[PDB]
Design a protein around this ligand. Structure first.
Ligand SMILES: *[C@@H]1O[C@H](CO[C@@H]2O[C@@H](C)[C@@H](O)[C@@H](O)[C@@H]2O)[C@@H](O)[C@H](O)[C@H]1NC(C)=O
Ligand SMILES: *[C@@H]1O[C@H](CO)[C@@H](O)[C@H](O)[C@H]1NC(C)=O
Ligand SMILES: *[C@@H]1O[C@H](CO)[C@@H](O)[C@H](O)[C@H]1NC(C)=O
Ligand SMILES: *[C@@H]1O[C@H](CO)[C@@H](O)[C@H](O)[C@H]1NC(C)=O
Ligand SMILES: *[C@@H]1O[C@H](CO)[C@@H](O)[C@H](O)[C@H]1NC(C)=O
Ligand SMILES: [Cl-]
Ligand SMILES: [Cl-]
Ligand SMILES: [Cl-]
Lengths: 74, 385
């Protein structure tokens, strides 16, 4: 037998997730790639990213704690 | 093993523009290992970044540190939870004195809750929990280097997530009850992914199950490691091509609403057939107030047939069934929706996601090793309106 009966609870919401429930990251290490600008400038990549809006984009990872901002760097 | 690197205004602008132009909300992790002599966080580099972003009018949220439970391993520096909490309070004061005084702050981005991590989280939330807008933690099921194909399909592996989420809420309920809990970084396998696994159709069982459990259990936001990057757990590969988890993610967004409900299997064995139920996404023009979205995973090696309970047993149902494109089966990087391969129309154009309407009153077929969404039309559920 391969038939499975389901029970549903529909009386009230059990939780409310954010509209951005499904969010994404970019690993902080990607910022060390010399092609960072080329990669995130990709129109194809932005089209795919827009498909997931609304969402958070978290820029973070192990490299977060080994990155220093330098306002003189070019 | 990890060295310091610098980044430029240019890098910041690249990242911000990517987010802004894609309709995404940027969260930027600040470096927590910049320390004064007395081991306080040194905020002076963050101050420079803040002033720069303030000067460009950038709308950004913040984190401070990543996996602080590992700082000893990674950098030979130990920061306890109390101190990390104090450091977050100091960041919160800098934010409040900046041009975006209402910017959000999340943390502490701990790993999953082993004994030492749970202690760090508890002390952090006692010390610094007043200034965070949500609590972030990280989860992976496996090590990318040792993961097997059977691991990705094993309900006993999938179920371990449940006890991790329970343990996190135990800590949060004992220190900051009601504070929102986010998965701040999560995927199948750590260490960049598992190859021909984390980037295939087979990765979708872990990803959809984690989304279903997270929503069911009260997690508000889940952040997928990674959208794009070196690791095999990327949604989009090196050639900018979307992988099966991208398409799964896009379908989930189109169909699944914010109100979480519950579905469960009647039989005693609830390991291999996994089911989740939300209100249908109200932004979807094909559906109407009161419709339900069911999603289901079949980890049995045969087709299962699902029967909907009264009062939904004769409703019109739209099927959205995902299966791999051959010849590589579960190890495929290509996926079909109701028999049609999913592919970009061109570089600016996503395809429509086409339903298969089922005949009213039919049971819901779910093939072996597959996952599907089902929209119950005219469900007229009051909780959803
Ligand atoms: C298929 O899976 C079997 C264990 O699962 C049970 O039996 C199958 C036929 C389904 O009815 C499923 O719902 C049950 O839970 C294994 O004993 C059998 O070895 C498997 N066959 C193959 C070819 O791998
Ligand atoms: C990183 O830089 C900071 C400040 O310049 C310094 O205190 C620390 O020792 C450096 N760590 C590594 C691994 O280079
Ligand atoms: C914080 O770091 C900056 C930059 O390295 C340094 O010049 C400054 O003296 C540090 N402040 C403290 C209080 O240690
Ligand atoms: C910035 O973005 C957030 C979403 O994270 C939004 O709700 C907020 O109102 C925006 N604030 C400004 C000042 O643009
Ligand atoms: C935690 O670390 C700080 C900073 O080094 C130290 O001053 C404090 O006494 C420690 N607290 C506990 C509970 O160990
Ligand atoms: Cl972890
Ligand atoms: Cl600690
Ligand atoms: Cl990366």
């Amino acid at each position: 037998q391969d038939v499975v009966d389901l029970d549903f609870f529909t009386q009230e919401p059990l939780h409310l997730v954010s509209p951005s429930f499904l969010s994404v990251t970019i690993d902080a290490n990607l910022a060390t790639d010399p092609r960072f600008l080329i990669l995130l400038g990709s129109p194809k990549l932005r089209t795919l990213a827009r498909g997931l809006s609304p969402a958070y984009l978290r820029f973070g990872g192990t490299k977060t704690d080994f990155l220093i901002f330098d306002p003189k760097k070019e | 093993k990890f060295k310091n690197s610098t980044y430029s205004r240019s890098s910041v602008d690249v990242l911000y523009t990517f987010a802004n132009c894609s309709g995404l909300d940027l969260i930027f992790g600040l470096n927590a290992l910049l320390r004064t002599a007395d081991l306080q966080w040194n905020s002076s580099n963050a101050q420079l970044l803040l002033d720069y972003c303030s000067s460009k009018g950038y709308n950004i949220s913040w984190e401070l540190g990543n996996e602080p439970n590992s700082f000893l391993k990674k950098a030979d520096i130990f920061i306890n939870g109390s101190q990390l909490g104090e450091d977050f309070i100091q960041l919160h004061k800098l934010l409040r004195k900046s041009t975006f005084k209402n910017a959000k702050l999340y943390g502490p981005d701990v790993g999953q809750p082993r004994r030492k991590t749970a202690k760090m989280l508890k002390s952090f939330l006692k010390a610094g929990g007043e200034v965070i807008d949500s609590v972030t933690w990280h989860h992976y099921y496996l090590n990318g280097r040792t993961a097997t194909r059977e691991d990705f399909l094993n309900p006993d592996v999938l179920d371990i997530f449940i006890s991790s989420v329970q343990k996190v809420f135990q800590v949060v309920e004992s220190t900051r009850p009601g504070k929102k809990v986010w998965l701040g970084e999560t995927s199948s396998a750590y260490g960049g992914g598992a190859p021909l696994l984390s980037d295939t159709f087979a990765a979708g069982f872990m990803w959809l199950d984690k989304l279903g459990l997270s929503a069911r259990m009260g997690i508000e936001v889940v952040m997928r490691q990674v959208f794009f990057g070196a690791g095999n757990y990327h949604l989009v590969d090196e050639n900018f091509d979307p992988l099966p988890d991208y398409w799964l993610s896009l379908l989930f967004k189109k169909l699944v609403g914010t109100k979480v409900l519950m579905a469960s299997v009647q039989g005693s064995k609830r390991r291999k057939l996994r089911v989740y139920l939300h209100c249908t996404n109200t932004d979807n023009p094909r559906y109407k107030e009161g419709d339900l979205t069911l999603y289901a995973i079949n980890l049995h090696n045969v087709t299962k047939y699902l029967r909907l309970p009264y009062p939904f047993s004769n409703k019109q149902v739209d099927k959205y069934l995902l299966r791999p494109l051959g010849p590589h089966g579960l190890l495929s990087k290509s996926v079909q929706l109701n028999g049609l391969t999913l592919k970009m129309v061109d570089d600016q154009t996503l395809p429509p996601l086409m339903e298969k309407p089922l005949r009213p009153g039919s049971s819901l077929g779910l093939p072996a090793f597959s996952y599907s969404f089902f929209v119950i039309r005219n469900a007229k559920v009051a909780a959803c309106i």
